[PDB]
Enzyme design. Sequence first.
Site, PDB file in Angstrom:
ATOM      1  N   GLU A   1       0.832  -1.187   0.000  1.00 23.25           N
ATOM      2  CA  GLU A   1       0.000   0.000   0.000  1.00 23.25           C
ATOM      3  C   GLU A   1       0.851   1.214   0.000  1.00 23.25           C
ATOM      4  OE1 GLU A   1      -0.661   2.850   1.864  1.00 23.25           O
ATOM      5  OE2 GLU A   1      -2.772   2.974   1.844  1.00 23.25           O
TER       6      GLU A   1
ATOM      7  N   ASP B   1      -8.580   1.114   7.092  1.00 18.86           N
ATOM      8  CA  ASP B   1      -7.263   1.663   7.139  1.00 18.86           C
ATOM      9  C   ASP B   1      -7.235   2.639   8.306  1.00 18.86           C
ATOM     10  OD1 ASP B   1      -4.689   2.080   6.336  1.00 18.86           O
ATOM     11  OD2 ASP B   1      -5.223   3.211   4.547  1.00 18.86           O
TER      12      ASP B   1
HETATM   13  C1  LIG Z   1      -6.499  13.430   4.945  1.00 20.67           C
HETATM   14  C2  LIG Z   1      -5.986  14.374   3.857  1.00 20.67           C
HETATM   15  O1  LIG Z   1      -6.445  15.514   3.948  1.00 20.67           O
HETATM   16  N1  LIG Z   1      -5.040  14.014   2.746  1.00 20.67           N
HETATM   17  C3  LIG Z   1      -4.420  14.939   1.593  1.00 20.67           C
HETATM   18  C4  LIG Z   1      -2.889  14.410   1.518  1.00 20.67           C
HETATM   19  C5  LIG Z   1      -2.983  13.069   1.519  1.00 20.67           C
HETATM   20  O2  LIG Z   1      -1.872  12.249   2.021  1.00 20.67           O
HETATM   21  C6  LIG Z   1      -0.474  12.509   1.966  1.00 20.67           C
HETATM   22  C7  LIG Z   1       0.122  13.743   1.861  1.00 20.67           C
HETATM   23  C8  LIG Z   1       1.535  13.895   1.840  1.00 20.67           C
HETATM   24  C9  LIG Z   1       2.330  12.785   1.935  1.00 20.67           C
HETATM   25  C10 LIG Z   1       1.773  11.532   2.038  1.00 20.67           C
HETATM   26  C11 LIG Z   1       0.373  11.392   2.056  1.00 20.67           C
HETATM   27  C12 LIG Z   1       0.036   9.968   2.154  1.00 20.67           C
HETATM   28  C13 LIG Z   1      -1.245   9.549   2.159  1.00 20.67           C
HETATM   29  C14 LIG Z   1      -1.708   8.273   2.792  1.00 20.67           C
HETATM   30  C15 LIG Z   1      -3.030   7.924   2.572  1.00 20.67           C
HETATM   31  C16 LIG Z   1      -3.496   6.791   3.118  1.00 20.67           C
HETATM   32  C17 LIG Z   1      -2.651   5.972   3.953  1.00 20.67           C
HETATM   33  N2  LIG Z   1      -2.885   4.816   4.582  1.00 20.67           N
HETATM   34  C18 LIG Z   1      -1.705   4.485   5.228  1.00 20.67           C
HETATM   35  N3  LIG Z   1      -0.706   5.348   5.024  1.00 20.67           N
HETATM   36  C19 LIG Z   1      -1.335   6.291   4.199  1.00 20.67           C
HETATM   37  C20 LIG Z   1      -0.903   7.474   3.578  1.00 20.67           C
HETATM   38  C21 LIG Z   1       1.293   9.236   2.199  1.00 20.67           C
HETATM   39  O3  LIG Z   1       1.428   8.049   2.279  1.00 20.67           O
HETATM   40  N4  LIG Z   1       2.373  10.183   2.121  1.00 20.67           N
HETATM   41  C22 LIG Z   1      -4.422  12.834   2.450  1.00 20.67           C
END
Ligand SMILES: CC(=O)N1CC[C@@H](Oc2cccc3c2/C(=C/c2ccc4[nH]cnc4c2)C(=O)N3)C1
Lengths: 323, 323, 323, 323, 323
Positions: free
Chosen positions: B163, B210
């Site tokens: 993921e 998640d």
């Molecule tokens: C909630 C919200 O407002 N947002 C906008 C940005 C986005 O996520 C990120 C922004 C910057 C760096 C990032 C990620 C990000 C998202 C993410 C999403 C779901 C996940 N489940 C487990 N780890 C996970 C990681 C990641 O892995 N690295 C979610």
Amino acid sequence: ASAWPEEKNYHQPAILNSSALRQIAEGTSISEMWQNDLQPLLIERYPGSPGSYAARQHIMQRIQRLQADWVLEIDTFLSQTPYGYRSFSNIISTLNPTAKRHLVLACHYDSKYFSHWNNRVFVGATDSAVPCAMMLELARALDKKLLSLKPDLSLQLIFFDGEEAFLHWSPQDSLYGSRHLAAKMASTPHPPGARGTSQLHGMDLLVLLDLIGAPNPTFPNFFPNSARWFERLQAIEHELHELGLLKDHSLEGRYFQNYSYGGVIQDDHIPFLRRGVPVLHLIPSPFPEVWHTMDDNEENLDESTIDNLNKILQVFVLEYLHL
Amino acid sequence: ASAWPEEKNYHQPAILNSSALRQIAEGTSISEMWQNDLQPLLIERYPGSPGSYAARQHIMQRIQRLQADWVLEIDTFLSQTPYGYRSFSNIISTLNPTAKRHLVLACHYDSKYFSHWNNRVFVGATDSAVPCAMMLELARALDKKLLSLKPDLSLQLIFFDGEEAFLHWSPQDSLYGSRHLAAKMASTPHPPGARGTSQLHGMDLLVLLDLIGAPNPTFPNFFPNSARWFERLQAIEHELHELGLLKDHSLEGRYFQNYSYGGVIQDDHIPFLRRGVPVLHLIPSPFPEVWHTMDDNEENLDESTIDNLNKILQVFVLEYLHL
Amino acid sequence: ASAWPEEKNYHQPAILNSSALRQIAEGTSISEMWQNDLQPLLIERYPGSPGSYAARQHIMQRIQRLQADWVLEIDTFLSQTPYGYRSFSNIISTLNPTAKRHLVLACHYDSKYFSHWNNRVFVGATDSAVPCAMMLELARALDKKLLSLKPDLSLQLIFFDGEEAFLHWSPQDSLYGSRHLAAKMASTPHPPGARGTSQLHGMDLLVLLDLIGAPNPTFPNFFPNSARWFERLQAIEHELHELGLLKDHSLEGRYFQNYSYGGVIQDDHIPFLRRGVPVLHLIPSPFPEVWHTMDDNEENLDESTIDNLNKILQVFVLEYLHL
Amino acid sequence: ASAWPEEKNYHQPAILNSSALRQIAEGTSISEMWQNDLQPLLIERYPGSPGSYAARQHIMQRIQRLQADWVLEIDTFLSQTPYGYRSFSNIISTLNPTAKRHLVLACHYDSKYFSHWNNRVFVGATDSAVPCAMMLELARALDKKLLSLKPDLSLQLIFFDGEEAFLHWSPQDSLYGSRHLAAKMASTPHPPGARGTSQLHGMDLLVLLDLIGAPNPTFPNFFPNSARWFERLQAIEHELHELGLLKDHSLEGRYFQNYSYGGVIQDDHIPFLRRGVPVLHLIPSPFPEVWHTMDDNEENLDESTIDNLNKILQVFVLEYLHL
Amino acid sequence: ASAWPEEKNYHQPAILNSSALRQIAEGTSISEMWQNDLQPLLIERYPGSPGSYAARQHIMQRIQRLQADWVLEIDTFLSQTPYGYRSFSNIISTLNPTAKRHLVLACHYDSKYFSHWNNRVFVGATDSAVPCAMMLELARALDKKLLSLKPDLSLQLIFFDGEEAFLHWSPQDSLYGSRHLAAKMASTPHPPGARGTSQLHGMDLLVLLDLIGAPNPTFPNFFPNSARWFERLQAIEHELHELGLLKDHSLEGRYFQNYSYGGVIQDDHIPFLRRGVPVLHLIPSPFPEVWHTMDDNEENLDESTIDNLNKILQVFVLEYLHL
Ligand SMILES: CC(=O)N1CC[C@@H](Oc2cccc3c2/C(=C/c2ccc4[nH]cnc4c2)C(=O)N3)C1
Ligand SMILES: CC(=O)N1CC[C@@H](Oc2cccc3c2/C(=C/c2ccc4[nH]cnc4c2)C(=O)N3)C1
Ligand SMILES: CC(=O)N1CC[C@@H](Oc2cccc3c2/C(=C/c2ccc4[nH]cnc4c2)C(=O)N3)C1
Ligand SMILES: CC(=O)N1CC[C@@H](Oc2cccc3c2/C(=C/c2ccc4[nH]cnc4c2)C(=O)N3)C1
Ligand SMILES: CC(=O)N1CC[C@@H](Oc2cccc3c2/C(=C/c2ccc4[nH]cnc4c2)C(=O)N3)C1
């Protein structure tokens, strides 16, 4: 690429008065809408069906019989889908096609393909027949005022086809009608003989109606280049109220509540937005409860809220056009 | 193409009476889950890694030992990455694999890669060991009832691998197991024999879990093609609450709040969302405070909030499956 | 007059450093409270009852056994009620009764009179057994730092009697114990010998505990004349949080959110508020769900919120007293 | 004393199943109410006036004509106003007046006194002519069921006179009729013969309807001692919505929102609240936009909402009364 | 690889004591800035205009004239547009070009292109002249403590060109400058001679200023990989106020409110964010009311607010850099 495509950015409205506004509210009839303009469209009508042609037909009839000189075109085109090449047709209805600048109203007139279940049929009463009727009723009400077009600005309605996905919602399978129409308009000099300006330049503002007809709608202000126009709908809503001209309507339940929205709805506007057309997206958030269910029928429509949005939008539109 | 691909649009649950609901709620032990299903997974387990195999192994072991007819598959595969090709391995576990329609529960068993710091190691407890364990514990607590499957609908669990980005969040670098599984099922006929329909046509709903396991989460109603299934999670939460079956929980601090969410979070559902699968994204907004820090461990998990969600989810699932 | 009656307006705390916050957090035990201070109080204990006495005796015994020089008054007294004259017993414990100024913590140690209903008795664990014990635990854990009092400012604790209506809430029937004391205090000179100042001029702040122990509490900022002390409660939650010293806690489930509150809640502060004492009213809004029902028991207390509050409260105090 | 006055603290509703709730929705008629209950009441009807006598006759008539053994009184009395001693006349309609306990519905039939102005008259549609018609329409739509009463508890309706100030709203000039009956009942032993219990001990709950009839009301949860019963109105409202039984309604414009309120609103309940009767104050916050204006007339009433509240209220009562 | 490029993930700030907070405040002059830094940027300055050049060299003279050893660079380049290939000149000013890690702050020095209307010209005060200045003034104000760089970490500024669309917002016609410089850093090794790590690996955090300068901004917490630094911008605004170091400022009008955002803003960070650079996007939501209108002039800038934001940012940079 002259300077006329930037007039949009300074256009200002011709605010109406209590007396005019009174005339506007009394000059629209939600029951003639309901019977003449909306009840004919509540039929299965996905792309290519016989419904699509009956409704396509109903629409042009209703426009053809009005005094203003509406130049209807049909924009039939072909596109692949997940079930294979199907044939779509957009309806465009223009006043003064030669006018360089237009204000546009648009909805979609297809209905989502669904199979029948317990012998009921999906017909999209809010998605988007009411929108279609609203627009049709707005040309019918404002007809005499819309002859006055014989600033270089006029009005276009657009009824898109294939808005809805055939099977499974995604860029490849949605918005078939629009861009198409987008891409087509982007590549058609305006005015004619123009040389660097497309018909999109001339699209002042695109008012997209969608998902209208449920109770207690709330429309957000989605985009900053149109916020001022959204604010004019706030002001109109408020005035029509203070004069007593809205029905069962309270301010603690306005429709146009100033509330920025985070994300974006995908709808027929995206082909015109990502070409720098300004969009006023009158789609409510949250969608109706009856979204995409066989209960998106007429039984579940609110006549009061539509009469009301009709007054507001009719007003919005005459002030836009300085009429 | 038949019409069974649309059965899902009209599926209604078999709502449990109270007696029933207590019976489910006495039926799950957070302590068993806690030490038999979850603690084994609190290990560095990025892909390729040894806890990647150990975890895979463990998960399987716990399914194997149940009565129900769980059919396990692996789906080792291979994709380019910023550190070059690597080999992933999804776990799918299916009941009644020729059932046409399935409810899917899913989560992700990898753990982000992080070099060690101060002698500390990332184990993602909420991201997503706990979700993993909540599924296991669901498969356990509802065993005897999942038996009764020998409307053509069963259950399927998927534990995606890959993921997380390896380096840095981006399409090309994220969502390895799901982008592949979604493409592969989108191109597998279902049921076996079919000429028009994919296994995707068969996913009734994908419930993705998640980032679960922190105190005070709030999940929003991300999508409208699953809004009614969200509203049931609300209805369950209230009714399980008013009966005293939830612990340390008030309605002023409920988890499923009718709060729609602007835009989107990118997660394992995206692959499936765009192919038309309806999705119930049980991710919270905001993320837990420990999100992507060494401090995302056991010591920071609210055992009481997990027990409560086990209960909710297990009821949801029995109600969907008319068990 | 003199001008110590106004020091309370300029008095500022000595805020603690991470290191010292760790000592306080490590220094309270919720399990020694739950059993040593609280469980003895979980009995019917209405005025005149035999519980009134055992709780009265319990409270004293617990204080009596600490090393700081707590001076314990009983203010037994008589007041008319709907069922006639009855005896009540306020409990007052004081450090340095001559210290001119005192910070005051207070709760009520009675419980409402309800008859027995299908074998259930009312014990008020939120209302207000938990606040009683929280005070006892505070005296305990702070004992050693409280010795350091042999600004002329010490601490006082008050457990009121007769807070609850006997029959039906009204001014004439409620706050029997704090209506008395407030008024006996306003007319007791302080310090000994004074001539125009009362014991009430010395109440720097009344910190009143009520209805505490349910999950997810939220306390408003009720009075502008104590806001800044509430702002301090916020700060202490936040920092104790940022330091990992709260359990099952998040900032999105804060207890002290600077939302203000419209109207007033009658309680033992009123007789003081109305005479110009600054009151910090730590009662939640909304009330606990179990308010004034036989389910206001130990089963439905949230151990971890209480412990969290103990640590917040214990800090506010030492900060206020520069210990 | 006896035990019975505390019964109301444990009294649970007999919830109704879908089929029942469909019967009730179908049993009330908003147009019948409108034409034969409510239109006679839209007259100038301030105390003393010819309106008050006609209005009073009209209520009795409509009650008298019913099959349940309603017992009409006219408590007439005299009290001092800013213009001198005027005569008032409460209306009480009771079933089974030996029924030790009663649920009470109540509103106010007087109209506020205004000079004629610009040839208009104040007639007080929402204040409170609709609430009078609702209580009327409920006695009719539930007659067959209310007959079953030949737990010892029945139903009483009260129409108060003189609720409105004569000159300018003050405790002296307001609530003439309720301040009267509050007292008269607090001193009329109940049941006949008793020796310590009044007619107010035998009020389980007062449901006061005030200012009902306008679009988009939102009613707050004013009192924690009736909050369990406000919740049921939430529940009823939701279930009737889920079942198609409400008109032009959305849950995002719910009427009963768990929104607690700040400071008190003065109304006919105050003489009973401070005497210990639990109250369910069905008044909206904020007030109708047309409050105390000539515009508070038939024309600005939303029939749809009143129909919906009729159904909700009618259900509430059957569930309370176990019919 | 190596382990150096994860250091960003663990960096704690060196938090300043009240006493330094006061010096930092004392040390920036909004009147200096306005006059010496910002006023010269208030000209028509689109890419390849003379304004552009004017504006470009000015920046550099304000950095050239300081004692810290900033290293200007003009990364001039060519790119296709809706009006042909044109030329663009970024500006980058680094301290310690070899420092592995760098806190980067950036803004955009172009002005959108507009025809002249009523003899009026678009100069873009918020967008982004003020942020250009704020950055200058940061470096003036901080020059002496910056010199202390002869944790391998230093400071970079970037004034992007071409942010703005020439014709109509679109991934093809926007963000020219950053799309360029992002790819060019993704493609530059660093530190010189490294073999698997680029300049973008040593962007510890990118602080992007945009649309700053208007009354009452509110800045969302857009990303989670950067939330904890937003929390610091929040604890800084708090303490500077709690110390009377902000002007015309109340906490009920905070600039940084803990409200998360739904969708996303396209701005000069996109090209760094989808390449895995952490972003603190200091753009307000909503946008200034004057956005992309001629009123985005100096007349409409809140000098009090800018001065307040200058202080917050200057503190942030220092606690990051452990100065
Ligand atoms: C909630 C919200 O407002 N947002 C906008 C940005 C986005 O996520 C990120 C922004 C910057 C760096 C990032 C990620 C990000 C998202 C993410 C999403 C779901 C996940 N489940 C487990 N780890 C996970 C990681 C990641 O892995 N690295 C979610
Ligand atoms: C806030 C919001 O709801 N949204 C959705 C639309 C999008 O912004 C636009 C919409 C329509 C036309 C536009 C832009 C737009 C965005 C933008 C972003 C940052 C900017 N900084 C300076 N000018 C800048 C311009 C632009 O330049 N022209 C952000
Ligand atoms: C409530 C809300 O705020 N949103 C955001 C967009 C929309 O997205 C969807 C998500 C999942 C499946 C979907 C669609 C969706 C969107 C949509 C947008 C506009 C429409 N107008 C008429 N039907 C239309 C369909 C559709 O057809 N199938 C819900
Ligand atoms: C909605 C809200 O926040 N409020 C504040 C007081 C409450 O009123 C009541 C209303 C009716 C009957 C009542 C009480 C009431 C209040 C109350 C206040 C503080 C208490 N501390 C412990 N029990 C206590 C009982 C009580 O005993 N009986 C309205
Ligand atoms: C807007 C709101 O929600 N509130 C709370 C109480 C109310 O009080 C008033 C304030 C100022 C002047 C007033 C009254 C007022 C109250 C009132 C209350 C109940 C009524 N029911 C019918 N007419 C009635 C009149 C009146 O008659 N004159 C304001």
